[PDB]
Scaffold this active site. Structure first.
Site, mmCIF file in Angstrom:
data_model
loop_
_atom_site.group_PDB
_atom_site.id
_atom_site.type_symbol
_atom_site.label_atom_id
_atom_site.label_comp_id
_atom_site.label_asym_id
_atom_site.label_seq_id
_atom_site.Cartn_x
_atom_site.Cartn_y
_atom_site.Cartn_z
ATOM 1 N N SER A 33 66.152 15.635 53.021
ATOM 2 C CA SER A 33 67.580 15.337 53.086
ATOM 3 C C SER A 33 68.323 16.229 52.109
ATOM 4 O O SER A 33 67.932 16.311 50.942
ATOM 5 C CB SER A 33 67.825 13.877 52.703
ATOM 6 O OG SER A 33 67.170 13.568 51.486
ATOM 7 N N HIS A 64 68.135 24.314 54.039
ATOM 8 C CA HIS A 64 66.867 24.361 53.324
ATOM 9 C C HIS A 64 66.880 25.592 52.432
ATOM 10 O O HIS A 64 66.828 26.720 52.918
ATOM 11 C CB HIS A 64 65.696 24.392 54.317
ATOM 12 C CG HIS A 64 65.615 23.170 55.181
ATOM 13 N ND1 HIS A 64 66.501 22.924 56.208
ATOM 14 C CD2 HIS A 64 64.810 22.082 55.115
ATOM 15 C CE1 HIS A 64 66.255 21.737 56.731
ATOM 16 N NE2 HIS A 64 65.234 21.204 56.084
ATOM 17 N N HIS A 86 59.106 22.548 59.336
ATOM 18 C CA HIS A 86 59.081 21.682 60.518
ATOM 19 C C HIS A 86 58.356 22.421 61.639
ATOM 20 O O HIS A 86 58.477 23.647 61.765
ATOM 21 C CB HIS A 86 60.504 21.377 61.007
ATOM 22 C CG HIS A 86 61.432 20.876 59.941
ATOM 23 N ND1 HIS A 86 62.055 21.711 59.039
ATOM 24 C CD2 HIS A 86 61.859 19.623 59.648
ATOM 25 C CE1 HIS A 86 62.822 20.997 58.236
ATOM 26 N NE2 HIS A 86 62.720 19.726 58.584
ATOM 27 N N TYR A 88 59.108 22.447 64.704
ATOM 28 C CA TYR A 88 60.073 23.042 65.623
ATOM 29 C C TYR A 88 60.514 24.458 65.254
ATOM 30 O O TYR A 88 61.287 25.074 65.986
ATOM 31 C CB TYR A 88 61.288 22.125 65.845
ATOM 32 C CG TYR A 88 62.177 21.910 64.636
ATOM 33 C CD1 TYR A 88 62.883 22.968 64.065
ATOM 34 C CD2 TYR A 88 62.330 20.648 64.082
ATOM 35 C CE1 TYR A 88 63.716 22.773 62.979
ATOM 36 C CE2 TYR A 88 63.161 20.443 62.993
ATOM 37 C CZ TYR A 88 63.850 21.509 62.447
ATOM 38 O OH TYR A 88 64.669 21.317 61.355
ATOM 39 N N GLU A 89 60.053 24.962 64.109
ATOM 40 C CA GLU A 89 60.390 26.326 63.687
ATOM 41 C C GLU A 89 59.354 27.270 64.275
ATOM 42 O O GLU A 89 59.470 28.489 64.146
ATOM 43 C CB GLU A 89 60.339 26.465 62.168
ATOM 44 C CG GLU A 89 61.384 25.691 61.414
ATOM 45 C CD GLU A 89 61.129 25.713 59.922
ATOM 46 O OE1 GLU A 89 61.163 26.805 59.323
ATOM 47 O OE2 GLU A 89 60.886 24.638 59.347
ATOM 48 N N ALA A 116 66.184 12.849 56.343
ATOM 49 C CA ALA A 116 67.407 12.286 56.921
ATOM 50 C C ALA A 116 66.971 11.838 58.303
ATOM 51 O O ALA A 116 66.323 12.601 59.011
ATOM 52 C CB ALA A 116 68.486 13.343 57.026
ATOM 53 N N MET A 219 62.303 14.376 62.560
ATOM 54 C CA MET A 219 61.442 15.470 63.000
ATOM 55 C C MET A 219 60.566 16.038 61.878
ATOM 56 O O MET A 219 60.265 17.226 61.876
ATOM 57 C CB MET A 219 62.312 16.600 63.562
ATOM 58 C CG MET A 219 63.372 16.162 64.558
ATOM 59 S SD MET A 219 64.617 17.443 64.799
ATOM 60 C CE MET A 219 65.713 17.153 63.471
ATOM 61 N N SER A 220 60.147 15.202 60.932
ATOM 62 C CA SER A 220 59.327 15.686 59.827
ATOM 63 C C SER A 220 58.622 14.565 59.072
ATOM 64 O O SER A 220 58.484 13.453 59.580
ATOM 65 C CB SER A 220 60.215 16.450 58.847
ATOM 66 O OG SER A 220 61.090 15.563 58.163
ATOM 67 N N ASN A 243 73.023 8.622 60.462
ATOM 68 C CA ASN A 243 73.773 8.236 61.647
ATOM 69 C C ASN A 243 73.135 7.098 62.425
ATOM 70 O O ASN A 243 71.943 6.827 62.281
ATOM 71 C CB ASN A 243 73.962 9.441 62.577
ATOM 72 C CG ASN A 243 72.765 9.677 63.487
ATOM 73 O OD1 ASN A 243 72.615 9.023 64.526
ATOM 74 N ND2 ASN A 243 71.911 10.622 63.108
ATOM 75 N N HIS A 257 75.711 17.388 65.009
ATOM 76 C CA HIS A 257 74.983 17.553 63.755
ATOM 77 C C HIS A 257 75.814 17.284 62.497
ATOM 78 O O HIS A 257 75.715 18.027 61.517
ATOM 79 C CB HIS A 257 74.392 18.964 63.702
ATOM 80 C CG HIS A 257 73.298 19.134 62.696
ATOM 81 N ND1 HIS A 257 73.371 20.049 61.668
ATOM 82 C CD2 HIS A 257 72.096 18.525 62.573
ATOM 83 C CE1 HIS A 257 72.260 19.998 60.955
ATOM 84 N NE2 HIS A 257 71.470 19.080 61.483
#
Lengths: 289, 289, 289
Positions: A33, A64, A86, A88-89, A116, A219-220, A243, A257
Site C-alpha cells: 500500500s 512502487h 507482482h 501480473y508484471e 491495498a 493481487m499480491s 474501496n 484506480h
C-alpha cells in the site's frame, strides 16, 4: 514452472547486503500500500535501489519506489521493501518472492506485510484496516505456486502447512494496540483472496469471490506469506481497504484506480502509525531491550 | 507468461491489411459458433487466409475455416474472423487475442463476439440464444491473462475495469430487435463462464460452475473481451446454447460433440439473421447514414 | 504449455518394454498411497527403474520408490507404478501422464488409481477408503491440462467427455466385494478434488473446497484419469483417507505430514487386500479364465 535461483544465489545477495551496512534488522516489512511515509519514520535510514543489488528483480508498477531501505523504526531495527513485485508484471513467483528468502539469510525473524485491497465484506468501509486472519490462494489452485519445482531442504520441508500462517500472538497484539490508539472505528479482521490481475473484477466475479468467503481482494502478498512460512518466518499483515467493490449491475460500475486517494493520505497515515507502535510489541530483543 | 508482440508488430499487420483492401470497416465480428452462413451474407466480400497475413496465428480446431473476411453486412462495412483461436490449441493468450488489437489499429470501434456454449441455467433450452451480460474468467484467477507482462500504454491502462465490458446500450438494442423479429422464444441473458478445455465437464464440475452463478460455459471469448475492453472497443456478444449439460449422475452422461447439429443449422441461422439486423442499430455513421 | 512427446516416443518406450519381459498385462495400477505391500503380493515380479526406461520421467518425492513392476496379482497379470509423478515437482502434465499412454500401447485396458487424500466430508474417519465417484479438476479451470496443445488423433478425440470417467460397473463390483470382506466400516464414495500443492491447505481453503462439494482433497490422479479416458482406458480408483482436515481456526491447526502412519500400515493393508480381490472381478479374460 520451476525455481531458477540456487541456494547460493540467495547467499551471495545476503552477504553483499551484510557487507554494505552495519545494520542487522530482525524484522522485514513489505509495503504494498502506498505508504511512503513509513520510510519517513525510519531513523539512520540507508537505501539500496533494486537495480544495484545482485540478483534483485526490478519494480515496474507505478507508485512502487523500487528500493530496499534499512533503518530504525520506533527503536526496532528493520529492513523494508518500498514497493513489491507482482505476477501480473510477467514475473514468475520464484522471482516475486526472492527477497523473502534473502531476509531469512540476513537473520530476520518476523515479516510484516501490507497491501491495498478491495472490500468484499459489506460491513467494511473505505479506509478500513483489515488484520489478515487467513487467505485463499486462487493462483495456487491451478498450480502456480512459488514453491513449484525441486524443494530446497536448507529452507524448509516439501509439504508445509498454511493453516497457521498468520501469527496469532501478533494478532492479539494488533487488537490491543488498536484499542490504545483510541480509534473510533474498530479494527477489522478477515480472509484475503488473491488473484492474478491486472484488470479489475466484474460484478459477477466479485459476487463469486464473496460467496466463497472472501473479505478483501488483491493481487499480491499470498506468495510471500507462503515462502516466508516455508522458511520459518513469523508472519502477520494488513490490508488497507481502498474501496468497496460493486455488487450490483446498475451503479457507478467501472472500477477505476482511485486507490491513490487513500494511499499516502487518509487511512495510510493511520496504518503507518499503527505499524510503528506494533514494532515495540514484536517478540525478541532489539527494541531497546 | 508475457507478451511477445511489440506495438510495431500490430502496426505492420494493420498497414499490410490497409494496403490490400480499400474497405475500412468500423465493426469487427469474431464468429466462434459454426456460423459460416454469416460470411454468406457479406456483400463485396474479400478473404484473407490467416497463413498469408503477417504475424497472424493459424487456426487448427475443426469447423474453424481460418480466414479473415471483409465485406458489407446489411449496409454496414465490417471485418470478421471465420473461426477463432483457443488456449487449448497450445496458444498463449497474447496470440489468441492478436487480431483484436490489429482491429483497433484498422479503426474499428465495435467488436461483436459469438460462441457456442453449454447451458447451465435450467431454464435454457437447446437452441437458445443468450445475450452475454457478464463473464467469469476462471483462467484469470490463476494468472493466465492475455494482459500479463509489461503493459503497452499505447493500447490502454495497467488496471482496466471489466465490470462494464458488455455494452449496455447495445443490450437494450438486442432486446428491442429480438422483439421485432417476432420470435416465440424469449432472448436469454446471463453470465458466461470460461475454462481451458479441451475435455468436456463432469457432472460435479457442472454443478460447481452453476452454483457459482454461471449461466453458460465455454472455452473462449473472455480473453478477447478483456483485450478489446483494454484498448477501448465497445463489446457485446452472444452464446448459441448448443446443449443442456448433465447435472445428475444417472443419465445419458457422456457429453458428446453433437454441437455440430445446432451449428450451421437450427438456431445458428436465426443468430446470423439476428446479427445482420443489429448492424443497423450499431452506433456511428457508416450504415447508409 | 504443449505436449513434447511425439507418438513415436510412446511407441519406442512400449516396444522397449515388450522386448524385455514376456509378460503382457491387461491391467495397470498406479499406486500413490504408500502401498509398498501391493508389490509384495506380486508373483513372478520383475522390476524396472524409471531411470533405465527410455523416455520415462524420474520420481523425486519421498516414499515414491520410482520403479515399474510387472507381475501376477491374484491370478491377474498386471503392471504397476510404485510411485507417481506430481506437477508440484516441476513436471508439466504431459510428463506426469507419459506412462498412461505407454500402458495403452502395451495393450492394457483397465487402469486402477490410488492415492492418499485429506477428508473434507465430515462423516469420513481417518483410515476410510473412498471409491472415487467423480472429480473436480481445479488446475484444469486455469488451462493447465495434460491434453493442452495439438491433439494426437491416434490416441483420441479433441473434446473427450469426463462425466463418465469412473467406471460404473467396477464401482458396483467394489461395493459387493467390500461386503464380502466382512468389514465393520462401510465403503465410502465421493468426489475427489485436486489442486497443485505442495503446501497443505488453510482452514479458509478447506472450507471453500468443501462448500464446492468436494469429499476429499489431493495433489494428483486427476491428470492421469483425463489422459486414460482420452485414450480409452477403463478407469476406477480409491483414496485412502489419511486425515480429517481442520475446519475451525482454534484447534491443532498445523496440518503436519503424518500421512505416513496410515500409509504402509493401518488402512493401507486393507486397501491392498481390497485391490487384490478386485482383480478377479475385473472384466476380460486373463484371471485364470
Amino acid at each position: 514452472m520451476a525455481n531458477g535461483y540456487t541456494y547460493e544465489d540467495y547467499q551471495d545477495t545476503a552477504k553483499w547486503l551484510l557487507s554494505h551496512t552495519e545494520q542487522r534488522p530482525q524484522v522485514a516489512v513489505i509495503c504494498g500500500s502506498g505508504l511512503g511515509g513509513l520510510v519517513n519514520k525510519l531513523t539512520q535510514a540507508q537505501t539500496f535501489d533494486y537495480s544495484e543489488i545482485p540478483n534483485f528483480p526490478e519494480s515496474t508498477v507505478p507508485g512502487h519506489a523500487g528500493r530496499l531501505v534499512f533503518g530504525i523504526l520506533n527503536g526496532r531495527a528493520c529492513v523494508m521493501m518500498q514497493g513489491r513485485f507482482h505476477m501480473y508484471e510477467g514475473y514468475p513467483f520464484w522471482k516475486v518472492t526472492f527477497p523473502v528468502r534473502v531476509f531469512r539469510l540476513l537473520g530476520v525473524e518476523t515479516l510484516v506485510v501490507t497491501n491495498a485491497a478491495g472490500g468484499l465484506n459489506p460491513n467494511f468501509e473505505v479506509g478500513d484496516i483489515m488484520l489478515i486472519r487467513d487467505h485463499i490462494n486462487l493462483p495456487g489452485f491451478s498450480g502456480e505456486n512459488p514453491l513449484r519445482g525441486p524443494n530446497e531442504e536448507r529452507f524448509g520441508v516439501r509439504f508445509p502447512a498454511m493453516s497457521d500462517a498468520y501469527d496469532r500472538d501478533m494478532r492479539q497484539k494488533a487488537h490491543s494496540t488498536w484499542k490504545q490508539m483510541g480509534e473510533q472505528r474498530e479494527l477489522q479482521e478477515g480472509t484475503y483472496v488473491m488473484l492474478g490481475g491486472p484488470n479489475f473484477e466484474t460484478v459477477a466475479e466479485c459476487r463469486l469471490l464473496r460467496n466463497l468467503g472472501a473479505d478483501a481482494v488483491g493481487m499480491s502478498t499470498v506468495p510471500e506469506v507462503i515462502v516466508a512460512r516455508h522458511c520459518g518466518l513469523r508472519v502477520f499483515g494488513f490490508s488497507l481497504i481502498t474501496n468497496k467493490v460493486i455488487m450490483d449491475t446498475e451503479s457507478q460500475g467501472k472500477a477505476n484506480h482511485e486507490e491513490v486517494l487513500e494511499a499516502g493520505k487518509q487511512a495510510a497515515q493511520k496504518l503507518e502509525q499503527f505499524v510503528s507502535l506494533l514494532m515495540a510489541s514484536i517478540p525478541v530483543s532489539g527494541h531497546t531491550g
